[PDB]
Amino acid sequence: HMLEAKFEEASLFKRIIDGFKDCVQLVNFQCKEDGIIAQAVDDSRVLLVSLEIGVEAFQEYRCDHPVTLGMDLTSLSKILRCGNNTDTLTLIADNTPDSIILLFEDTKKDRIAEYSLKLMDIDADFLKIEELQYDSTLSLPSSEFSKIVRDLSQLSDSINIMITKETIKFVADGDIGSGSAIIKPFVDMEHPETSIKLEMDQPVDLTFGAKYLLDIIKGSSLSDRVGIRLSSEAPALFQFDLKSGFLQFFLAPKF
Amino acid sequence: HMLEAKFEEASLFKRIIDGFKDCVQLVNFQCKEDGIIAQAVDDSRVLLVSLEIGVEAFQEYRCDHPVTLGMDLTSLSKILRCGNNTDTLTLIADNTPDSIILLFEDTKKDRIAEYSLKLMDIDADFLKIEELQYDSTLSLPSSEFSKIVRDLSQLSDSINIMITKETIKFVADGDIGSGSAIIKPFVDMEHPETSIKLEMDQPVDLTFGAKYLLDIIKGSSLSDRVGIRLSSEAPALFQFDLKSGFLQFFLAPKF
Amino acid sequence: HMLEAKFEEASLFKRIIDGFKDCVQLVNFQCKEDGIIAQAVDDSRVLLVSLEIGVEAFQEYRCDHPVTLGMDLTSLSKILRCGNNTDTLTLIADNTPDSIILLFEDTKKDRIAEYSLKLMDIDADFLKIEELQYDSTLSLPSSEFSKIVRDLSQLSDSINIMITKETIKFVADGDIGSGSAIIKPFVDMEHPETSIKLEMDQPVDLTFGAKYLLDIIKGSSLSDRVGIRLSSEAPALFQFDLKSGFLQFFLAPKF
Incomplete structure (x- = not known):
């Protein structure tokens, strides 16, 4: 004690x-x-x-x-x-x-x-894989992000996040068909926390497993917003801001 | 497009x-x-x-x-x-x-x-099996019909609809016992949509599978009332009236 | 009839x-x-x-x-x-x-x-196993008792009720760890039905199966309070008081 x-x-x-x-x-x-x-x-x-x-x-x-x-x-x-x-x-x-x-x-x-x-006995292989600069940085309502992931998961096990300038595009493509949810950055004043930000330094075309994304969006209950950082070099960073703290999800792209 | x-x-x-x-x-x-x-x-x-x-x-x-x-x-x-x-x-x-x-x-x-x-490729065998005159024609609250079907399904896989003059009788008979729900045609004024109608031209004694009836009553969410037309010759017609449209269930009797 | x-x-x-x-x-x-x-x-x-x-x-x-x-x-x-x-x-x-x-x-x-x-055909082996004097007699809110049983069931299949003077102790001990809920007898006035009584004539250390206790606490929906009588000689008596009637659960200890 x-x-x-x-x-x-x-x-x-x-x-x-x-x-x-x-x-x-x-x-x-x-x-x-x-x-x-x-x-x-x-x-x-x-x-x-x-x-x-x-x-x-x-x-x-x-x-x-x-x-x-x-x-x-x-x-x-x-x-x-x-x-x-x-x-x-x-x-x-x-x-x-x-x-x-x-x-x-x-x-x-x-x-x-x-x-x-x-208590268990766990190996101490601590990882520091967060990058300084990411190709794209965006933040959107966590509840909205969960909607996009869940809906596209119905189609295939591969969700492709495609980011160009002022265009955030989520695409799924499976056997029964396909789906595409496209959101654009804007500003709100009645409730500025529903806004969507995007800071693209370089276009992004990454593919992630639906299995993992479904687990990642479960952190929507901890924060209203979710910060997503995409890079072609390192795993993507999904971050939920806590009160004096954070919950990060580092996910490696497919292919 | x-x-x-x-x-x-x-x-x-x-x-x-x-x-x-x-x-x-x-x-x-x-x-x-x-x-x-x-x-x-x-x-x-x-x-x-x-x-x-x-x-x-x-x-x-x-x-x-x-x-x-x-x-x-x-x-x-x-x-x-x-x-x-x-x-x-x-x-x-x-x-x-x-x-x-x-x-x-x-x-x-x-x-x-x-x-x-x-899109799938489906054969074009379209059926027109609706009769002109049915032996009995009745209409009751859809929620009430779902109750009768669900309760009797507990007993056996065979629900027998038995219609005589001014008497609509639903009967199930299985291994653990039996059950019988009997409703009679009447008129209401506070909410005339809870009324029960019956136009019998000839007594009806048909037996239907419980498996199918359970799927049929799922259309209760589309209409407050359900129109049932029973005939000893052709399959029974369960009809749910939509707003500018309809959803029909043609079911063939057993035995 | x-x-x-x-x-x-x-x-x-x-x-x-x-x-x-x-x-x-x-x-x-x-x-x-x-x-x-x-x-x-x-x-x-x-x-x-x-x-x-x-x-x-x-x-x-x-x-x-x-x-x-x-x-x-x-x-x-x-x-x-x-x-x-x-x-x-x-x-x-x-x-x-x-x-x-x-x-x-x-x-x-x-x-x-x-x-x-x-109707089934059941043998008429009626049992009268209720004792006159039990080593300990206690009564607590039924909803509270369900909480203790359900929480401890997570740990192991053996819940040990341990009663000393003015101390009612529920203990579970399994592979992943253990748990201990300790309640003490008191009196309330805003709602005297949340009170906890204890009439110990002799200390009690009995072990019961979690499988059975989980079924016993399902009678919490019938009464606000549950009467528990523990004896080292005879099976324990869990009693839920009904309106003009009762529901008793006689449970034999382990070991």
Whole structure:
């Protein structure tokens, strides 16, 4: 009992985990003094999940020692289905820990639920694959992006994002036919968060697997907007902005 | 780009397809100058689905050429799950078409989704099996008819509709037991659409498969009332009245 | 047509059956002059379900003859999915019956649905295993008890209820980790039905199967509170208080 990180609402940490729990299985939660960060590469080694949770995301955070505690998402999510969404979730562990302790407590002092989670042993191959300059950079409503991905997934397992100047084009092409959703950058004032931005330095023609994109758009529940950075050189970066933190999805193109 | 039929709301065409998509698989959409009509016989050749969609059902309809464009329901329904229920769905095709183009556009000009559907090749065995005079003719609330069919389906796979004068009797008889729902014709004034009519010229004792009836009652979402015409000679006619059009289910009795 | 028991709402009898239909399969409904009682032991012979339905639970009850009519829950529940929740459900049978008749009728006289259920032949091994004195006796909100059982079921198939003085402790221990929910007896005044009582005569350390507890907590829909009596000698008694009646779950501990 030494780091005891504490969330205001247990739902918040649950929503964060639920955002990327489907695309991966094992995760290396590397928590330190300035907060918690984590990475997780899937089995096929084509999708990286990078997470950062700052101090301000907690209502009371402490960590007198850099502790790397990896664990299974399926096991972690099971314990996360025990709270009452508004309970006080406290992540407790000690120096060189065997298990992480999750403490659920409501506003009243009737319910005091304490859970233990046997920690996994994960290799420390941390990746830094974010580029300085991307060929194209765009940001759109997360709910809108989920719509495009889900609709095109009906047609084929290959969604081709094609970006030219002032033209963002999503195209799917399968056996039963094809589909094409085309959006253009604009500005709104009644609700400026529905706006679409585009900063193209060079035209982009990349192809991504539909299987992976469907898991990526599940982070729409964490942010209203999604930042997409496309490059012909490095994997694409799908970023969801959290309150004092972020959830990144690095996806490698096909072909 | 020559016929371009256009719906006010994309939901309407989706609801129509959803009304009969389960009981069949391939459909021959025979659209012409006065609107669109279609037929579909299942594999077992005991259930016919006849559809008619008049000009008034569209908000803007054109067709300078009688075009028969058949297609797969499963593939068609997939594309129909892309709209936003209130988008402008436009069915576009050309003379001697390879594929039918479905264009989704909302009120604003942000979303312009265009889909292509590879057309099937369906045989032109169109059937006209509607009789002049049926032994019995009745009409009841569609939601009420769905209740009777669903409840009796629990007991056995054979639902026997038995009609005598002023007595409409639905009977199921299986291994675990039996059930009998009996309704009588009457008139209401607070909401005359809940009334039950019956025009019996001759008593009817027909037996239908529960499997088929369950698919037939799925058209209750298209009309408040359902018209049933029973004959000992020809297949029974279950008819749902659309706004400027209809959805018919011709079902052959057992034994 | 001789006993014709009658419920005010068909939903009530449906909810009662739905309370214990999952943990067993065959049930011996032994109805008599003062009401209806029934017992059902599962295949593994470790869980007994005892039911009592008094006269006051019906809106109109009669029974001129003690009749034991056993039946299959699955078949009984099927027929129970036919009503409209507010219909007049009437259980009809005769002296030495072959089948039990279930009559559904609404407030209006349009719907008159009559169902027959072929009665099963069940052995008359009725059990009286309730003790006089139990080591511990407690009562808590049924919704709260369901929460504890469901959450701990995620961890292992063995939930250990551990009771000491003024301390009720639920513990699960599995491969991925463990969990512990600890509640203490108190009194509320805004809503005294959320209170927790405990009358310990002797400390209790019993282990129950999670499979069975999950079925037991399904009776939370019948009562706000659940009475639990634990004994080291006899099976534990989980009791849900009905309006003029009860639903009991006798569960044998492990090890």
